[PDB]
Amino acid sequence: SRVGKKLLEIPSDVTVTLNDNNTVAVKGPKGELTRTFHPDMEIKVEDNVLTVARPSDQKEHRALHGTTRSLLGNMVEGVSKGFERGLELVGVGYRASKSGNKLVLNVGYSHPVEIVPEEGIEIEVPSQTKVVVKGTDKERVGAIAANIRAVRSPEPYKGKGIRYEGEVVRRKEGK
Amino acid sequence: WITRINAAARMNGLSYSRLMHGLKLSGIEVNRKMLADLAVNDLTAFNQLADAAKAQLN
Amino acid sequence: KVRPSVKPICEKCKVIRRKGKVMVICENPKHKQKQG
Amino acid sequence: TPMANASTIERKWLVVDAAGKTLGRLSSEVAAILRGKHKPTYTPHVDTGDHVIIINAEKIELTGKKLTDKIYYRHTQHPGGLKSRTALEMRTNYPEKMLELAIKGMLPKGSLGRQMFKKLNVYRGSEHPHEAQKPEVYELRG
Amino acid sequence: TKGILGRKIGMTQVFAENGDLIPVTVIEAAPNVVLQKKTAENDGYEAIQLGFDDKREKLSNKPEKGHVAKAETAPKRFVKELRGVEMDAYEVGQEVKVEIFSAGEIVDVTGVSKGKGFQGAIKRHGQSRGPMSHGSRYHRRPGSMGPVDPNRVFKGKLLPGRMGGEQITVQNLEIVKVDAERNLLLIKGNVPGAKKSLITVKSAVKS
RNA sequence: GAUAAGUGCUGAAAGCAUCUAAGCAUGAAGCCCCCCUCAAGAUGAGAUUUCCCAUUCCGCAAGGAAGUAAGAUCCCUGAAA
RNA sequence: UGGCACCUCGAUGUCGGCUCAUCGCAUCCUGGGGCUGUAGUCGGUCCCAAGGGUUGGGCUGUUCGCCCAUUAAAGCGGUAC
Numbered sequence: 001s002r003v004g005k006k007l008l009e010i011p012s013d014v015t016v017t018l019n020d021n022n023t024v025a026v027k028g029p030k031g032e033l034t035r036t037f038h039p040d041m042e043i044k045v046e047d048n049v050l051t052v053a054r055p056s057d058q059k060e061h062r063a064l065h066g067t068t069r070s071l072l073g074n075m076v077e078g079v080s081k082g083f084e085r086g087l088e089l090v091g092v093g094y095r096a097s098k099s100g101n102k103l104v105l106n107v108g109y110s111h112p113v114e115i116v117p118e119e120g121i122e123i124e125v126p127s128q129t130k131v132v133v134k135g136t137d138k139e140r141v142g143a144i145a146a147n148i149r150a151v152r153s154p155e156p157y158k159g160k161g162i163r164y165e166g167e168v169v170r171r172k173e174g175k
Numbered sequence: 176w177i178t179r180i181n182a183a184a185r186m187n188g189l190s191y192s193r194l195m196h197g198l199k200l201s202g203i204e205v206n207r208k209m210l211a212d213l214a215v216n217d218l219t220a221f222n223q224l225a226d227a228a229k230a231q232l233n
Numbered sequence: 234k235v236r237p238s239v240k241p242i243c244e245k246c247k248v249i250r251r252k253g254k255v256m257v258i259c260e261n262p263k264h265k266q267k268q269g
Numbered sequence: 270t271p272m273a274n275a276s277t278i279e280r281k282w283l284v285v286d287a288a289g290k291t292l293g294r295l296s297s298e299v300a301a302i303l304r305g306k307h308k309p310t311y312t313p314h315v316d317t318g319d320h321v322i323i324i325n326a327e328k329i330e331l332t333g334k335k336l337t338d339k340i341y342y343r344h345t346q347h348p349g350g351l352k353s354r355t356a357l358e359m360r361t362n363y364p365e366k367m368l369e370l371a372i373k374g375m376l377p378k379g380s381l382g383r384q385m386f387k388k389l390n391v392y393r394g395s396e397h398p399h400e401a402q403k404p405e406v407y408e409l410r411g
Numbered sequence: 412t413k414g415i416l417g418r419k420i421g422m423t424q425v426f427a428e429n430g431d432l433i434p435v436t437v438i439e440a441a442p443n444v445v446l447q448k449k450t451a452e453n454d455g456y457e458a459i460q461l462g463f464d465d466k467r468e469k470l471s472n473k474p475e476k477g478h479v480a481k482a483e484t485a486p487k488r489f490v491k492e493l494r495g496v497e498m499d500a501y502e503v504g505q506e507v508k509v510e511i512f513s514a515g516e517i518v519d520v521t522g523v524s525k526g527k528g529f530q531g532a533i534k535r536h537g538q539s540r541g542p543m544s545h546g547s548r549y550h551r552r553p554g555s556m557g558p559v560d561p562n563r564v565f566k567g568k569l570l571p572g573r574m575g576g577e578q579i580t581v582q583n584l585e586i587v588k589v590d591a592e593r594n595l596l597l598i599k600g601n602v603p604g605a606k607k608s609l610i611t612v613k614s615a616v617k618s
Numbered sequence: 619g620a621u622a623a624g625u626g627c628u629g630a631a632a633g634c635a636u637c638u639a640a641g642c643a644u645g646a647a648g649c650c651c652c653c654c655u656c657a658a659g660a661u662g663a664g665a666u667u668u669c670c671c672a673u674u675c676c677g678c679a680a681g682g683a684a685g686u687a688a689g690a691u692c693c694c695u696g697a698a699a
Numbered sequence: 700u701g702g703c704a705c706c707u708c709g710a711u712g713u714c715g716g717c718u719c720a721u722c723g724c725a726u727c728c729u730g731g732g733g734c735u736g737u738a739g740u741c742g743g744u745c746c747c748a749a750g751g752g753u754u755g756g757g758c759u760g761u762u763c764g765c766c767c768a769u770u771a772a773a774g775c776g777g778u779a780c
Contacts, residue, residue: 057746063629063640064630141627142664146644158630178306185307213270216272218309251636253669258636262733354649455663475668538718539717539718541717554720557721565721569719604698
């Protein structure tokens with residue numbers, strides 16, 4: 001009933017290398033995922049299943065415990081397997097092909113929308129309406145999906161624009 | 176006078192206030208500040224009084 | 234939208250302290266309030 | 270009968286490293302050294318201090334939220350000309366005058382104060398071009 | 412970038428291929444000789460000096476003749492720098508002519524305007540008169556000098572004084588024709604300065 | 619380039635949630651640059667290139683006098699001033 | 700706007716025009732946003748924003764006001780009218 005001390009299994013079959021306190025190099029088959037973890041915290045990478053150690057205090061070290069452990073778990077899982085995000089294109093013929101690694105949108109704007117993808121990330125286009133972004137880092141995938149949806153957000157008077165693979169959009173009715 | 180005594184005493188590992196308390200507490204040295212400064216500007220006699228006070232400060 | 238008397242109205246309303254300022258957020262759009 | 274001094278003064282060169290020290294918690298002992306309060310031959314009208322050189326001025330630090338709180342105003346003489354810049358850009362772009370302003374603020378006013386300020390030296394980076402004077406290290410009391 | 416300098420002759424007209432009249436100004440140019448080169452390590456920045464319109468021997472002293480010894484030319488009357496150029500393709504003693512400019516290029520021109528002497532408020536700053544009838548005794552004079560509270564006059568009040576004769580720049584001027592045989596340039600428009608002055612002709616840097 | 623009101627990403631304290639407490643973004647005719655002009659009396663008086671040579675007398679001493687070199691000015695003809 | 704009364708001096712000349720202006724933001728226009736009882740076109744209301752801009756005449760009255768014709772707009776206030 002508290003994640004900060006509640007550890008979970010860490011096979012860490014990847015080449016998890018623990019450098020000095022305020023840095024960890026979690027490398028594996030997918031790639032190299034490195035990040036400094038809170039230095040003030042007592043990092044405990046022991047055997048295979050590692051953990052953190054809340055030293056003292058009430059309102060900050062508990063938060064550090066939870067955040068650092070969640071970051072470590074997400075990094076470990078990412079360096080072994082990735083995660084994707086779905087975005088829909090329901091609307092009036094808003095097409096989306098894939099010109100090379102880059103993609104072009106065909107929404108109501110007179111000029112076409114060009115989006116250069118950041119490196120390391122992957123985009124797949126099964127259909128012009130379905131865009132799937134894949135990667136090994138949750139933050140980057142979320143940021144790219146946020147940008148894509150911010151290109152043309154939906155509206156409350158009709159179903160158009162970019163969605164989130166079934167996002168709950170609240171619809172209004174009016175004259 | 177007080178400023179010069181303070182500098183010389185700090186050279187020895189003390190403060191002006193502690194040195195004055197120790198001097199008045201030990202053997203009642205009734206030397207004023209003027210002759211203390213003369214003994215500062217011509218020291219190695221100033222230091223002897225400083226260890227005299229350090230002895231009684233404990 | 235501002236209402237310097239911040240106070241829950243909806244049954245799902247929650248009180249948050251973003252950036253040292255009292256906030257309320259509800260799923261109904263007509264409920265956001267900032268202390269100030 | 271007390272001995273004043275004139276043309277019998279002797280100066281020295283001291284190097285002070287400002288890596289983790291607080292801004293105003295070393296610029297006061299530096300000012301005291303500049304004025305000359307640490308010599309038994311101190312005299313109030315003669316400027317019996319000595320030179321100091323400060324290196325690594327880029328590593329000084331503040332506390333709290335002062336990196337965005339403190340503001341420096343330099344109104345010119347024209348109407349409406351009140352300029353300002355925050356402490357963060359002051360440190361990233363003008364560290365030398367950032368330290369010099371504080372040191373000058375804690376010094377007396379008049380011709381003697383201006384000479385005492387003249388005997389200061391502030392540098393960025395780690396090296397100084399004064400090896401001919403053969404300076405020596407000084408460890409501040411803190 | 413690029414540029415040379417010369418004198419200015421006068422004004423005239425030119426009928427274009429569309430039978431359209433356009434005013435014109437004439438620049439004398441003549442070959443320019445590079446005299447020195449400045450480097451980042453030696454000087455702190457990159458530039459080239461230029462020389463133009465040599466003068467006779469009696470009008471130059473010994474340091475001047477020593478300076479132009481390396482470029483191997485006669486002493487010159489005008490010298491000025493020009494920053495931002497490609498530091499290669501330039502040697503000391505090399506010649507630079509009018510061909511560096513093409514017919515349709517855009518240019519900025521810099522000079523010094525004519526002097527006007529001691530001028531008054533109405534002409535110097537374009538202020539207004541007072542009425543000239545109805546029992547008025549206020550015609551061509553500066554206005555009030557501010558409020559009462561400050562006990563002083565602000566910095567920035569506008570008063571008569573010596574007017575003109577400073578440095579001005581006019582940008583975005585086209586070139587009409589290039590006449591290499593006489594070393595001529597034909598700009599379109601007006602240009603600051605009196606006749607027989609020194610005019611800098613540099614390629615446009617946007618605006 | 620950094621931001622205001624805003625919109626956000628992953629994320630705990632609080633097994634959920636959450637724009638934030640770690641961290642990472644976007645965002646104005648405001649702000650700092652980009653454009654034009656003045657600017658080393660900036661007593662902190664800055665830099666590069668080229669010329670002239672280390673004369674003669676008094677004074678043990680610091681110094682004090684006299685002709686000069688490179689270079690200027692007085693004086694005269696004028697205005698693009 | 701009153702109440703009350705501290706520097707009244709060979710006085711505490713109070714209001715409108717002319718010539719020159721400067722500052723505040725509690726924003727008239729222009730820039731960026733949240734809600735709507737916002738299908739769009741046009742709106743309403745609330746935040747962030749002080750860089751620039753913000754009109755010619757008739758009527759008698761010096762004042763206050765009423766009108767004619769424009770414009771993106773014809774903003775409130777302090778500086779001894």
